[PDB]
Design a protein around this nucleic acid. Sequence first.
RNA 1: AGGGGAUCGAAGAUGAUCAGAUACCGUCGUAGUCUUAACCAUAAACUAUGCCGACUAGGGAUCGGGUGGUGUUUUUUUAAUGACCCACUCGGCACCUUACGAGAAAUCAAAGUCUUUGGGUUCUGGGGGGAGUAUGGUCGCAAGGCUGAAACUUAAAGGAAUUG
Lengths: 81, 96, 25, 87, 129, 217, 120, 97, 206
Amino acid sequence: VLVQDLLHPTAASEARKHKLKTLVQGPRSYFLDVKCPGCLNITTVFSHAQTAVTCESCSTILCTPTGGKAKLSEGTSFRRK
Amino acid sequence: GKGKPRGLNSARKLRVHRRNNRWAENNYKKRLLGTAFKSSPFGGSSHAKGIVLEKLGIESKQPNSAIRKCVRVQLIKNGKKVTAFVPNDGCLNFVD
Amino acid sequence: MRAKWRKKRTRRLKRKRRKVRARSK
Amino acid sequence: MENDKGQLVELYVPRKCSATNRIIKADDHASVQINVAKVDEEGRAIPGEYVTYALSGYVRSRGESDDSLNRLAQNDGLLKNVWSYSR
Amino acid sequence: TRSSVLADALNAINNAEKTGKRQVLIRPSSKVIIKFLQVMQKHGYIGEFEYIDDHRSGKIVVQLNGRLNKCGVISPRFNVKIGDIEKWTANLLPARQFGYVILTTSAGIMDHEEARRKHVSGKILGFVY
Amino acid sequence: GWVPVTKLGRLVKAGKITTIEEIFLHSLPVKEFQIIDTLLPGLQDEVMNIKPVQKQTRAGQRTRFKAVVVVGDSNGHVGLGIKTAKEVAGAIRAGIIIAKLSVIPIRRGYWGTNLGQPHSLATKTTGKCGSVTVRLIPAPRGSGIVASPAVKKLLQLAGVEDVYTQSNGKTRTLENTLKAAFVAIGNTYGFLTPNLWAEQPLPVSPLDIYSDEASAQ
Amino acid sequence: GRVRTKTVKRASKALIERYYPKLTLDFQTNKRLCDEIATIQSKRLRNKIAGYTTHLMKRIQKGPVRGISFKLQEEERERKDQYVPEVSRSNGVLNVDNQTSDLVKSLGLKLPLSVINVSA
Amino acid sequence: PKKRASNGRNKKGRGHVKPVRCVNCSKSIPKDKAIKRMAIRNIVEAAAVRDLSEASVYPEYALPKTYNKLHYCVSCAIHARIVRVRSREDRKNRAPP
Amino acid sequence: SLPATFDLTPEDAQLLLAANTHLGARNVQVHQEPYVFNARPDGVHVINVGKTWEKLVLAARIIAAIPNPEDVVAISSRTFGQRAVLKFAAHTGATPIAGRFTPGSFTNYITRSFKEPRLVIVTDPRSDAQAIKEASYVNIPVIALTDLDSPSEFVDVAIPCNNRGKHSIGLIWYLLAREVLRLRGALVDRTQPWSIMPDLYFYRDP
RNA sequence: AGGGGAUCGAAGAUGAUCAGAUACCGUCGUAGUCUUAACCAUAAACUAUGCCGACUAGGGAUCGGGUGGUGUUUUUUUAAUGACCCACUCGGCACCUUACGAGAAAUCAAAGUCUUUGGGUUCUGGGGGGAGUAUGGUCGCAAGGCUGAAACUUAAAGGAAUUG
Ligand SMILES: [Mg+2]
Ligand SMILES: [Mg+2]
Ligand SMILES: [Mg+2]
Ligand SMILES: [Mg+2]
Ligand SMILES: [Mg+2]
Ligand SMILES: [Mg+2]
Ligand SMILES: [Mg+2]
Ligand SMILES: [Mg+2]
Ligand SMILES: [Mg+2]
Ligand SMILES: [Mg+2]
Ligand SMILES: [Mg+2]
Ligand SMILES: [Mg+2]
Ligand SMILES: [Mg+2]
Ligand SMILES: [Mg+2]
Ligand SMILES: [Mg+2]
Ligand SMILES: [Mg+2]
Ligand SMILES: [Mg+2]
Ligand SMILES: [Zn+2]
Ligand SMILES: [Zn+2]
């Protein structure tokens, strides 16, 4: 306070903020390849679905819509990319 | 900004509102209604000449006890009737 | 006198003048 | 504040706050001037010889007196990792 | 709704200075803010500044020295008439020996003294001292 | 005999500080009037106003007397002191002293040309106090002091040859008006202009220099 | 009541302040002391005083009393001053926190180690 | 001028609460402005409890207080109950004992 | 200006972790302190003691730097400070104020408590708030023993420690004394633990 | 205009009190109080404080949403839930402490960023009475609402704070 680097804010105090009040704004959601080992292939899901994402071939389920982040269902794995 | 339009074409509203609000000015409204020419025992003129009816003895307002000596005058251009005061000691003995 | 009793005072007053004036309609 | 020819007319050119470069006027009897000590080898502390800093009454009232001096002294090379320009 | 993007940057700058800061971050920048920002800096009332680039309208970080008492903005951009530029400076500048009224003329955003030398005039928008 | 108390008082009769400019440089809190006496003898007194005030008392009605006094040379130094006492002499006595202690510097200047010896002010300046705002405007030479008799005097005594003035408020209440015209001239060595942008090395404190030739025993 | 006015209590102060050597726990001599050592206008006011300056005297012996400082105490306070022989380097190791440790490792060097965990 | 930031008493963000009827004089009074008190007291009393237990069946029994919430009208609340009137500052303080 | 060996030593650090100077305040934590260092879970915040040790050095580097070491005033209204200050004063120039301060000591010549110092050192600007308030009426620098919840207004240079009681205050005051004698004054070469025990600057009993 | 009409209860009638007592207190109790279908459009309808946008300062609570946690508790076999705990973040109803600042003050995170006087916009006031009166217009079944003067009078009326 009184003199600080507004141009190079620290990654943490930057990280804790709001998605619009960061330096330059950008999302804080993410995508993921997801597999329920009944099948073999990997469907790409949105961390904040809304739509209860219907799996590829087997209409099994996958995730459920929520407040924000989707709840993935039962026995499933992932990765953020 | 509190109130008054600041804009660059808002000159009409700014005059109107002023026209409007001038009326709350005593002497502007007196002037424009012509209160002079209409009410007022004189014409609107500086003096007026009338005729003496009765000689009065007006008693003064408090905290002042006295008798003030006046004349009811009937203005000549008017017949409007008016009581007027007669200054300095005596002087009422001058009129009739 | 209380304001509201005066407001009533003149409410009545207008009713009478409202009345007396009708007489002449 | 010179004049028509040279001549430094008008007295008194006041101190400015080391922290805000604002004037430090007379009735500002809440402003402060700190002397930090020049020293030599193996402790010791060269009397009369100070590195000095001046802080406005405003600043001290606002609580920024410490922090702001931290910066000032440190990047004059007399504090060794205490401050941080980022936050 | 946001009405004069200049107004906000200017006020920010002033509130910072006032509170003893050395930097503002202003939002959302524009051609005009920069040019204004640039004019103050030319006579040293602020340090350097940086345009950061949100893929939007922009942000600006200004560095303040403390040499600045006031930078105001003239909210309706009145026409000034080369004769009437004198009347403005007089109204709202501390003395005739320093401070600038800045204005937008046909041949560029410029403080009144430059405007004088170049013999152009136009609309008025703000001032510094 | 004087006998100072305070470190600063001692240094003065000690002849180790020569001008208040010094005192102002380092913003030294004065506490002893003889300090500004032996520093600036050319000071002359002006009693600005005396008005009765009255307190009601659980056995009495005190009416004591409030006196306003302005002191100064006519060469850059004013004072504004106000004191109420049971007697007018006493009120005026104490007033002058407080007005001594209060003594501030004025930053005069040039209307708008570099010529010989500053005659007006440096910037427009405003002082407020209670409801009165007094606003001082730089004015060309021979304009004079354009202000109501009181404020014209307070200005004169601080040595201002030409300024314009404007006032807002219940100016009739002398006390607050002069107090605002006082704040106005105080505000000249606050307002920072280009000519004062250059950096100064930051002087050494008289109390640290003649530390010895101050101090008690 | 028998509450001594200020003038008595004030004067007793002033006398103990600057004549603690001389003066006694004895009123009778404190009396005579007051004659040589101070002017008073009435026998009554003197004993009234000396009695009380004896009182104050009689209980300085049993600890200080606020309001009276003949310097001889403030120096008694420093020569009556010392203690310690034990400090608080025994035994074993400085016990620290998880992060107090991390504070060490992130600046300094040598330190006996000893961690803990803490709970909500 | 004004005399309390809670104006009368306790209503910021509502417009209308509802009147209760003063337990003493039956004056109507908004529930948030109302001066209330839990009258938790025994059924018996002071020294009657000895006689109580002694001339009863069971051992020691139980003994269950009466509970009833009290609402006062200010004028009533001032005239006897909790109120006094405090200094300009002591007014500000909301802690009970 | 950087010394060379005035780094925070082994035994120094050991001293501070036995005093618990590094235990900063709880769910109370003044905006104006980055003297912190990773929140200890469940309440406490840990204090960067280097920053402490550095501030201490400034402290000394400014105390010594006053021409007459006695008009360098050392105040403490808190009991846990009183025993320390008197001992700080004795060892250095300095004049001591233990217990009650008595207001109007810096303003108002007439007062018999009168002082007029060139610097002030205070142990807890909550309790000693008077002094800090008074000095700002009459331009006087202030040095302060601060916690994570101390009122940094009108004090330049804080010494981020732990007025949560115990030994800290004394510890700090001791080190303070230690470095001002090391500075320009009669003391030593290298480490040299200093004769005087740190428990000499300690609150007593019962 | 129907229905309803327990309760409480303008009016009225009484018992008392009072010099009087058209009242305060006690009783009787019409309308009313509730509801349907229409009117009426006013309250200290209050935060006596327009709305949209920006900026300026600390603190602990709480309400709704969300994110993070090898947090606690629920046991079953660990999870999954749920409630709870801690950190942060949006948007709420408020309080605390300060005041850079504002104010005639009382006080005010707006009543701040105003003689260093301009972000946008709406509305109202211009000494006190006369008087929200007269008059015209208009709306209403009515009661009344909206719009709303003047002559004449007058040196104060008023605000906040202090001492009594
Ligand atoms: Mg009107
Ligand atoms: Mg007649
Ligand atoms: Mg004719
Ligand atoms: Mg007929
Ligand atoms: Mg007069
Ligand atoms: Mg009142
Ligand atoms: Mg009242
Ligand atoms: Mg309502
Ligand atoms: Mg019924
Ligand atoms: Mg009846
Ligand atoms: Mg009867
Ligand atoms: Mg009747
Ligand atoms: Mg209305
Ligand atoms: Mg209300
Ligand atoms: Mg806040
Ligand atoms: Mg969760
Ligand atoms: Mg009169
Ligand atoms: Zn599948
Ligand atoms: Zn009641």
